[PDB]
Amino acid sequence: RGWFDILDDWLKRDRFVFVGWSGILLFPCAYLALGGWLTGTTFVTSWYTHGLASSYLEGCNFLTVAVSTPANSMGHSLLLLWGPEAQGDFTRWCQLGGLWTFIALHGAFGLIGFMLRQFEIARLVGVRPYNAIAFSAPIAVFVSVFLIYPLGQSSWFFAPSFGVAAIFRFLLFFQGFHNWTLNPFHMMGVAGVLGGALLCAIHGATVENTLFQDGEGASTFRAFNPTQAEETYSMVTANRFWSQIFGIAFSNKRWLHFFMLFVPVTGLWMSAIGVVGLALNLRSYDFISQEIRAAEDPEFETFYTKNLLLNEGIRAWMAPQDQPHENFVFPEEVLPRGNAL
Amino acid sequence: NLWERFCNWVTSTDNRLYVGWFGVIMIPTLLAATICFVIAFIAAPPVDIDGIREPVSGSLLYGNNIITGAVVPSSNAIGLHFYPIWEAASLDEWLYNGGPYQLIIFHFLLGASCYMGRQWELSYRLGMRPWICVAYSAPLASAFAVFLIYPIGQGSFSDGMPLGISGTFNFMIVFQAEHNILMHPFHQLGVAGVFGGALFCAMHGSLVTSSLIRETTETESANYGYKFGQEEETYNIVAAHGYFGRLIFQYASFNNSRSLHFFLAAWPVVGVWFTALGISTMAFNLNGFNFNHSVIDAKGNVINTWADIINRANLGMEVMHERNAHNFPLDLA
Amino acid sequence: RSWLATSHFVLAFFFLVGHLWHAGRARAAAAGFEKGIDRESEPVLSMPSLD
Amino acid sequence: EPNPNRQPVELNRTSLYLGLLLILVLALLFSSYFFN
Amino acid sequence: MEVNQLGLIATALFVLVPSVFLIILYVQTESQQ
């Protein structure tokens, strides 16, 4: 048969865990990314890159551990273990943030391997590859946020650190410096995510509340047969219910499920486009007309101007510690603050 | 009998939009709230939300756009006091103190509760199972949390969420400043709920679309392979289960469609339930986790964590929010 | 006061949810369709179209 | 000789409503930024 | 308010061109039988 055909036969054998050709890329990279995150959050400090404790060994909990980004002076270095910065020293590599680049690159290639796995299994079992197309949106989000955004900025330092409180810092940083809530691409992302959650809940509840009685048990989960030819719920009844409640209703199941695909994927793609715009600092920060009016009229106030004052507070009060490489020394008298507080 | 005829019309399943008795309450309140919202969003004068005689402009005619416009919450001088139109001396006083916000939110909360009841009512009239309203109770609880319960806990309807986009962003940022909602586990459960809801929505849609049974040509849309009211299933759930069971592993895949759709209903509903409860429990000032200065070295020096960076951002928002409204060091409410 | 107020708001909301669940289920079980729609006697199929 | 690859194009009323909703909502979202 | 003057034409064309495109397609769909 040839070594290639025998190997292909072995890789595509039915197992508990399917491997496939894509497994060779997926399982090493994904395993290493997950193990690197656990190893970093368990043992590795951020003391030399950020001046932060970020591991269980330093006393942080699950919410506050992170594998932090490299220092700003490293730039966009790949920070290979054998690279010119670490020079093969594993301890120094961990101290310089090399675990972050390790996790980011291994995660990117793991996500590539997972979408290739989706394509390979879809080809093998004979189904259309819409799951891989749907998974393109998480890949777009990861590439825009963890790769494209720091590449646009000065260094890997301003990428998200792999941690819970670190991601919360990333959120607040984007609010304070980018006004990311005011960005219409992020608004489309929020619309896609919340609409996907709404569609998930509403479709599940609608199916569960229009089920046909196909059993005598009060618990209706037993009444479904996996190989049955009939629909397990009434589409006509569901359509009439939502037509009389909401005004409009689905009447095509295939269109319904494509719509369930379409909404969160499109939202995530729009948010990725907005994140690329923020990678170049092309923000939707301000409305120029409102700035002109508020500058020339000290009585004009909107919630947008209040949000701008909040962003000024965020920037001034978080900049010295969130960006220690700048050596920001902001005296107390220059810090913006309201009365009393 | 006239009353019997009216009862037959109200509960009729042949109306294009079902009314029901929950509808006889729902329709006037929602119409009043909608009309007042449109009129206020377009043409309301500025509103002294903080009670400090510094009115905030929220309508389109007074210099706002779609993003920045809002119906501004009622005055902090009002607090939790009931402020209808007839309690004001004039409409200009009512508009100055933020009366439209109270009218809109009270009518909307009544109408949305009756919307939940109406969902039950139509499900009962059609012979359905009744728990779609239970699913709708999660966004309804969220609306009650941000419009009623948070003002009740804080003691003023001025701290309720403004009826606008930028006002909503202001609500979020000030809430993070004062309650550390990101570090609250109920909000983390809510984020898990909405992220998982989007994930499982895309997953279920892509798996059903992937396993659609061929009933069309390449020329026509695949959606025409389904006919409304057909008995046969339009997709092969066995093929989709085989695909997903090879994607992760077999026992992580649902083979029961009823169990799968119950999971689809249950995950975001429970998550949003918990985040609405988070907003209410932070309304009673049970705030998120405080890990400021938690990590201490041997000498006693504070070793900062990411929680301390979050604390710096929260301090910035705290010192800048409502910059003229505070006279005393502590922001107790 | 914070502990009692927060805990009892959580409990009161969940009990409102439970009331909705059991009230709907009691209505459906008394009316005889808590286990689903009978295929041979689907009510919507016996109703005129909305449009 | 007619081209044999010509095909009829269809857009149903539901697709028209959905597309008009998409266009109008996108315009309502982006109009404030277009005016700035 | 000192808005962008091309804002009006941008928004107007942003509405009209895809809208009239969809209207063209729908009306020609209805006239087929």
Binding site: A249 | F228 | - | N12, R13, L24, F35 | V3
Partner: peptide, 30 residues
Amino acid sequence: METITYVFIFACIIALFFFAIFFREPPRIT
């Protein structure tokens, strides 16, 4: 002209709501 634009787009959305509810394609059982 910006306020007129916003109100016009909103009014077109509400008109589309009316036409989508009351002048939809009627779902026919098959």
